[PDB]
Amino acid sequence: GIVGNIKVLIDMLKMHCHKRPMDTEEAEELVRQWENVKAEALGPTHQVYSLSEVLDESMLVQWQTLAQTAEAKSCYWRFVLLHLEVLQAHIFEDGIAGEAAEIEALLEEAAELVDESQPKNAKYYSTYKIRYILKKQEDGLWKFCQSDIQIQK
Amino acid sequence: IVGNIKVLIDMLKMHCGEHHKRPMDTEEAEELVRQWENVKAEALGPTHQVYSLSEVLDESMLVQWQTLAQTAEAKSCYWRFVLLHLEVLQAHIFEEAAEIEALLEEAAELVDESQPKNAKYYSTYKIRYILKKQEDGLWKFCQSDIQI
Hints:
The structure is a homodimer. Chain A is an alpha+beta fold. The first copy, chain A, has 4 helices and 5 strands, in the order αβαααββββ. Chain A has helices at 6-16, 24-42, 51-54, 57-72; strands at residues 20-21, 76-94, 98-114, 122-136, 142-152. Chain A has a 5-stranded antiparallel sheet. The longest helix of chain A has 19 residues, at 24-42. The interface between A and B is medium-sized, with 24 and 25 residues. Chain B: Residues 96-113 form a coiled coil. Chain B: It comes from Arabidopsis thaliana (Mouse-ear cress). Chain B: Residues 1-148 are chloroplast intermembrane.
């Protein structure tokens, strides 16, 4: 049960180094903030801490591990989010205490794994449909807790 | 100006504006262009490795690219650059000088963190580079022109 596109990034690093509707603008800006934080954590500055600001539970653990692994191998990613479209966003009640959210989004992204010791870097370009589960935390803001890529082209 | 620097200048303003022929080896030309692409991505990136440009660039290319990178760092904005495709189409030497004609496809995101949404750039284009070999032996890119 590996979240997002973490398996693609691992393989690249190894080979080459109740229900309410949520406002679509708010879901869009949550996804954009996660994309920026993920670019910073895996980028040349290795902002590993920042993931705890937007991620929780499995998302945080797995992305944290991947970021630390990339920093350990002295390789980094350059990420470009070319297209984002939120297709659905909903909030629902989560058991006793908290609220949960689901965001279904279409993403187009390009990535370069930067290995300074080789002239050519590995690159990927991908269009994919992904579903995010978020949780409203003790304070006010949401955090991404799980993600599954459902479609890849 | 030299190749596609004006697109990046306009991007920085639109989104941070508030603030004796021989043939050359195709592998060597490809690796030169890849090294320049990486240096340009790091110089315009979040670490702003502006110095590194003088190691791969000279003359007009160096002056203009340095100005753009320093302006971007001054405005606390940066680019995330992905080189999606590089194809060297020709490479030639003239004795001390070289010309490399290449097709490049690249994507970039202009990041200004006082704003949630980043600016995007995507381009596939054909470019010609004029380089000069220095005393140290190594080539440096000195000028560039966009074709077609």
